[PDB]
Amino acid sequence: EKLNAFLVHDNVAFYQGDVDTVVNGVDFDFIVNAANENLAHGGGLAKALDVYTKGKLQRLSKEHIGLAGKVKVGTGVMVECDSLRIFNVVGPRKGKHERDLLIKAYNTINNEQGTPLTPILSCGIFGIKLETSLEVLLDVCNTKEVKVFVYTDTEVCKVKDFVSG
Numbered sequence: 001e002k003l004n005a006f007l008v009h010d011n012v013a014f015y016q017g018d019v020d021t022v023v024n025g026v027d028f029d030f031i032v033n034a035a036n037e038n039l040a041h042g043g044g045l046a047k048a049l050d051v052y053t054k055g056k057l058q059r060l061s062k063e064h065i066g067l068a069g070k071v072k073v074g075t076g077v078m079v080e081c082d083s084l085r086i087f088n089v090v091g092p093r094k095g096k097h098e099r100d101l102l103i104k105a106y107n108t109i110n111n112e113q114g115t116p117l118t119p120i121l122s123c124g125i126f127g128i129k130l131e132t133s134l135e136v137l138l139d140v141c142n143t144k145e146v147k148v149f150v151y152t153d154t155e156v157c158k159v160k161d162f163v164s165g
Helices: 019-025 045-053 056-068 098-111 128-139 153-164
Strands: 007-009 011-014 030-035 076-081 084-090 117-118 146-150
Touching: 007 153, 019 045, 030 045, 030 076, 045 056, 056 076, 056 098, 076 098, 084 098, 098 117, 098 128, 128 146, 128 153, 146 153
Parallel strands: 011 146, 030 084, 030 117, 117 146
Antiparallel strands: 007 011, 076 084
16 A cells, blocks of 8 residues: 555554545555434535545435435444445444443444444544544454544544553
């Protein structure tokens, strides 16, 4: 792959980039979308993925939602957008049962066949601390190779500090 990982920790490798950068720079089988229950890709990573796919992600998501209804928290829906397979995983919001649902969401990713390229779930609007989510990620995803990406230099620093500090 063209993009070098900034850190490899046993079976987990960490990358920095926007969607263009990681999709074109990293060798993976599917990319994880940090989706909401409506698969309504209105902001953040989900918007950037839809933009990358020229709206195909949102159209196929709409077709799924129209038939199946809302996606359950902790579960995923795979959508194939030309050569890019996008696994839409719904992480929990901050709240009492957040850990159990993060464990479920990360197991969903870990159990889906192939090498994932995944964000750290439930950051940003969902309100869960990066390091809290990352701990669950590393605890669950402890066998097959899993690739993790972040966007900003501050996120990179927090990852390095958590794992290596």
